[PDB]
């Protein structure tokens, strides 16, 4: 049919950054400390003035204590600002209803979860337990069906109202289970946590999970970001349609970006917003996290998120106006490395493994996901045909694809599936469909695709759509140059084949509704955590549930119209989730990858490494922190643990010695 081989070994990528590997519990623990500390102005300008309760009351009985042994530069000092530059825009503050805050670490810094996984890049193997975040501990029953979860006892929201099970329950019942509410990210569906999995309150600081499978420990990662982020239930519940006279759109848009001081479990709170300009966050006085010395975290008092572009984030970091960047667009690498070459540069650049991938995803729903018309339906039928996918992938010159982004040692031939940069990857297991355009052309002719009008474009058979020319719609993320470069390239190569492809370029917010809704034929997408880690959001590897897959979901309400490879892939993923055996887990992924790549669950375009860019003044930045693994580096670096020595501190605070106001008020509080 096609002469399949294994993908070629990429060029050697030296002068990277080595991770200092550590055991799971070297990072944090939950203990009551003898005495506690904070910035002197809080005690002298707020506590003594009345304005705030003493620190001891603001903190839980047992706070989250960061161990100093795991701190790269040791225990810190208070002061300075973290200046971010984002390419996104806020929709509002309702994360659990599916509103974007702008990305670039803004929703990571606000919405804290039951567990935490991003810092697990530094723990040895891939059978690691996620770190206890809002849930301090958990026990499994002798059978493996029940998880008793113990929450942090005594934590408060950034406004002062207690954090308890009512917030965890509100999210599970009124967002996850509730079919009308859709949490931000497109993957917090009920089955993400297992089919027929329930959750129930015991007491205010104890919740109980009930799983259909025995010890499906892989779900503790789904309890981390983005899928299990509780919101301020005392603010959200009176706006919720089950609890009020609000529609689901009224609830969704109940808190516009202008609405200030929204209650968070995160280290900073939004105090200022200026459309297309800036969002300013100030340290949360009710933060439940401290260091071994009793100092109430964070160290940095202020966070900025400049509303600009994704490319400008890179430009501004190497120049020194922005403090942080994930350099992920190969079109920026050369400019960034040139500025990095200067020894007097304000930022340090550090490349990691090839964990950034892009895949072509085809809509596999033939039972009407996204309500397709006759032309739409005809493409879903082509997409599900294995000979059409084999020809589409073989018409791709993958060497030229990589070279269209950046020439050199960065890119790797990527057929699809598991990222080559991850441990779970097996090269022998990956199926490579080499560049064979003439072969691809002949395969499309064999399924009934020939040019009928002599224009150079292929045609549907006489029986399909009146024998009209083939028309495919490609959904593209408008916020990235890479996505666009790839989208245009694919169109040019699909044109050489004969397939006519139309670019539908939408803004991030729009693109997600058109994708998660099913309103697409083909799409270009950057790979999420499951292809970069396997262990994080494993449910997205196959259609295990009716909404767990990026390219094969079913309409509400209907069962999946799965293909035999997808059915076998879902069996692999379900077995992997409930497996505690590492050798079984390693060969389950060798199996998974082979089924993926040979069947073409997605069609790989290219893969490459991103670099972490941080301003040199920042301390406690872990060595070898990837830009993307269990999550984005914003999460991985532990920003509440970052600090700056007082002789290095910048003068960038826009509300110095101020704290957040009340939810709904103007902004921050002084004087």
Q: Which residues bind Cl ion (CB under 5 A)?
A: 11, 34-35, 39, 67, 69, 78-79, 89, 111-112, 244, 265, 275, 408-409, 423, 639
Q: What would you report as the CA-atom Rg of the chain, rounded to the nearest whole angstrom?
A: 25
Give every CB contact of residue 50 below 8 A, 6+ residues apart in sequence: none
Task: Kindly list the distances between the CA atom of residue 234 and the CA atoms of 38, 149, 158, 437, 635, in Å, as whole numbers in the listed order.
Answer: 27, 22, 12, 59, 26
Total chain residues near Ca ion (CB under 5 A): 22
Per-residue mark of binding to ligand GLA, 605-634 (x: CB under 6 A): ---------------------------x-x
Which segments within 571-667 are labelled E, that is strand?
603-608, 611-615, 659-660
Of positions 154, 232, 546, 604, contacts Ca ion by CB under 5 A? 546
C-alpha 579: how far from its chain's center?
Answer: 24
Total chain residues near ligand GLA (CB under 6 A): 9
Query: Minimum distance from CB of 634 to ligand GLA (Å)?
Result: 5
Give every CB contact of residue 48 below 8 A, 6+ residues apart in sequence: none
Q: Residue 657: phi, psi to the nearest 5?
A: 65, 40
Task: Kindly list the distances between the CA atom of residue 268 and the CA atoms of 8, 158, 437, 646, in Å, as whole numbers in the listed order.
Answer: 46, 8, 53, 21
Q: Are 409 and 11 in contact (CB under 8 A)?
A: yes
C-alpha–C-alpha distance, residues 626 and 353, integer Å? 8
C-alpha–C-alpha distance, residues 85 and 305, integer Å? 5
Is 124 a binding residue for Ca ion by CB under 5 A? The answer is no
Query: Minimum distance from CB of 152 to Cl ion (Å)?
Result: 12
Query: Minimum distance from CB of 275 to Cl ion (Å)?
Result: 4
Query: Minimum distance from CB of 274 to Cl ion (Å)?
Result: 8
Per-residue mark of binding to Ca ion, 68-107 (x: CB under 5 A): ----x-----------------------------------
Of positions 78, 103, 288, 520, contacts ligand GLA by CB under 6 A? 103
The residue (of 38 and 634) whose beta carbon lies closer to ligand GLA is 634
C-alpha–C-alpha distance, residues 95 and 543, integer Å? 24
Query: Minimum distance from CB of 310 to ligand GLA (Å)?
Result: 6
The residue (of 240 and 552) whose beta carbon lies closer to Cl ion is 240
Q: Are 607 and 357 in contact (CB under 8 A)?
A: yes
| Candidate segments 140-148, 198-206, 584-592, 622-630, binder of Ca ion by CB under 5 A | 622-630
C-alpha–C-alpha distance, residues 6 and 44, integer Å? 66
Of positions 76, 104, 352, 609, contacts ligand GLA by CB under 6 A? 104
C-alpha–C-alpha distance, residues 430 and 240, integer Å? 47
Q: Are 283 and 303 in contact (CB under 8 A)?
A: no
DSSP state of 277: T
**Relative orientation angle of helices 481-497 and 386-394, to the nearest 10 degrees:** 110
Of positions 16, 40, 203, 665, contacts Ca ion by CB under 5 A? 40
Of positions 182, 326, 459, 599, contacts ligand GLA by CB under 6 A? 326
53-92 positions binding ligand GLA, by CB under 6 A: none
Residue 554 interacts, among Ca ion, ligand GLA, Cl ion, none and using kind-specific CB cut-offs from 5 to 8 Å, with: Ca ion
Query: Minimum distance from CB of 633 to ligand GLA (Å)?
Result: 8
C-alpha–C-alpha distance, residues 411 and 402, integer Å? 6
Q: Which residue has the tokens 């045609």?
A: 459
Query: Minimum distance from CB of 288 to ligand GLA (Å)?
Result: 22
The residue (of 302 and 635) whose beta carbon lies closer to ligand GLA is 635
Is 217 a binding residue for Ca ion by CB under 5 A? The answer is yes
Q: Which of 227, 204, 208, 276 is nearest to 107 (CA)?
A: 227
| Candidate segments 67-75, 314-322, 575-583, 644-652, binder of Ca ion by CB under 5 A | 67-75
C-alpha–C-alpha distance, residues 131 and 146, integer Å? 19
C-alpha–C-alpha distance, residues 36 and 296, integer Å? 7
The residue (of 241 and 517) whose beta carbon lies closer to Ca ion is 517
Q: Which of 38, 4, 21, 230 is nearest to 122 (CA)?
A: 21
Residue 104 interacts, among Cl ion, Ca ion, ligand GLA, none and using kind-specific CB cut-offs from 5 to 8 Å, with: ligand GLA
The residue (of 528 and 549) whose beta carbon lies closer to ligand GLA is 528
Q: Are 658 and 40 in contact (CB under 8 A)?
A: no
Residue 79 interacts, among ligand GLA, Ca ion, Cl ion, none and using kind-specific CB cut-offs from 5 to 8 Å, with: Cl ion
Of positions 174, 291, 328, 640, contacts ligand GLA by CB under 6 A? 328
Is 361 a binding residue for ligand GLA by CB under 6 A? The answer is no
Of positions 61, 204, 453, 587, contacts Ca ion by CB under 5 A? 453
Query: Minimum distance from CB of 635 to Ca ion (Å)?
Result: 13
Residues that bind Ca ion (CB under 5 A): 40, 44, 72, 217, 396, 398, 409, 435, 451, 453, 455, 457, 459, 469, 546, 554, 556, 564, 567-568, 621, 623
Residues that bind ligand GLA (CB under 6 A): 103-105, 108, 310, 326, 328, 632, 634
């Amino acid at each position: 049919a096609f002469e399949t081989t294994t993908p070629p070994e990429p060029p050697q990528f030296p002068a990277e950054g080595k991770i200092n590997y550590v055991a799971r519990d070297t990072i944090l623990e939950f203990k009551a400390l003898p005495s506690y500390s904070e910035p002197d102005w809080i005690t002298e300008k707020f506590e003594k003035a009345g304005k705030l309760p003493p620190l001891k009351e603001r903190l839980p009985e047992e706070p989250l204590v960061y161990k100093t042994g795991n701190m790269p530069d040791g225990v810190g000092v208070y002061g300075d600002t973290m200046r971010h530059v984002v390419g996104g825009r806020p929709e509002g503050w309702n994360y659990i209803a599916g509103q974007s805050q702008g990305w670039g670490g803004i929703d990571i810094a606000l919405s804290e979860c039951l567990t935490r996984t991003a810092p697990l890049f530094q723990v040895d193997a891939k059978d690691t337990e996620p770190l206890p975040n809002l849930a301090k501990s958990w026990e499994w029953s002798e059978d493996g069906h029940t998880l008793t979860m113990h929450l942090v006892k005594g934590a408060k929201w950034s406004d002062g109202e207690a954090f308890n099970a009512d917030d965890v329950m509100f999210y599970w019942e009124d967002a996850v289970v509730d079919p009308n509410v859709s949490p931000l990210g497109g993957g917090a569906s009920p089955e993400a946590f297992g089919e027929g999995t329930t959750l129930k309150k015991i007491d205010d600081y104890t919740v109980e999970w009930t799983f259909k499978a025995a010890f499906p420990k892989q779900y503790l990662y789904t309890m981390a970001y983005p899928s299990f982020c509780p919101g301020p239930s005392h603010i959200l519940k009176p706006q919720h349609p089950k609890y009020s006279k609000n529609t689901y759109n009224q609830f969704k848009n109940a808190f516009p970006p202008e609405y200030m001081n929204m209650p968070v479990m995160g280290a900073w709170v939004p105090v200022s917003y200026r459309p297309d300009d800036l969002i300013v966050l100030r340290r949360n006085p009710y933060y439940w996290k401290v260091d071994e010395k009793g100092q109430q975290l964070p160290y940095l008092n202020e966070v900025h998120y400049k509303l600009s572009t994704w490319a400008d984030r890179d430009v501004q970091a190497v120049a020194g106006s922005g403090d942080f960047s994930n350099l992920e667009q190969p079109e920026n690498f050369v400019a960034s490395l040139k500025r990095a070459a200067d020894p007097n540069a304000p930022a340090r650049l550090a490349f990691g493994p090839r964990l950034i991938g892009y895949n072509l995803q085809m809509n596999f729903s033939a039972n009407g996901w996204g309500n397709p018309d006759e032309r739409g339906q005809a493409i879903r039928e082509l997409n599900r045909n294995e000979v059409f996918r084999q020809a589409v992938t073989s018409a791709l010159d993958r060497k030229a694809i990589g070279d269209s982004l950046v020439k050199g040692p960065f890119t790797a031939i990527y057929p699809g599936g598991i990222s080559s940069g991850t441990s779970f990857y097996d090269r022998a297991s990956t199926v490579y469909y080499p560049f064979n355009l003439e072969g691809a052309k002949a395969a499309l002719a064999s399924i009934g695709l020939k040019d009928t009008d002599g224009d150079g474009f292929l045609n549907f058979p006489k029986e399909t759509l009146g024998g009209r020319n083939v028309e495919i719609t490609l959904l593209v993320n408008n916020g990235y140059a890479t996505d666009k470069s790839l989208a245009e390239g694919l169109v040019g190569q699909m044109a050489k084949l004969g397939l006519r492809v139309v670019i539908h370029s939408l803004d991030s917010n729009q693109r997600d509704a058109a994708h998660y809704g099913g309103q697409f034929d083909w799409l270009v997408r950057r790979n999420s955590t499951e292809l970069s880690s396997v262990v994080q959001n494993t449910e997205q590897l196959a259609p295990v549930g009716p909404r767990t897959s990026w390219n094969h979901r079913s309409p509400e309400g209907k069962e999946l119209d799965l293909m035999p490879f997808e059915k076998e892939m879902a069996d692999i993923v379900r077995k992997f989730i409930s497996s505690q055996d590492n050798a079984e887990r390693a060969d389950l992924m060798k199996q998974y990858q082979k089924v993926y790549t040979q069947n073409l669950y997605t069609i790989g375009l290219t893969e490459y490494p991103g670099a972490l860019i941080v301003n040199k003044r920042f301390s406690n930045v872990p060595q070898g922190t990837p830009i993307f693994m269990f999550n984005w580096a914003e999460d991985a670096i532990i920003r509440e643990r970052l600090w700056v020595a007082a002789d290095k501190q910048g003068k960038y605070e826009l509300f110095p010695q101020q704290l957040p106001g009340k939810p709904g008020e103007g902004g921050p509080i002084n004087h």
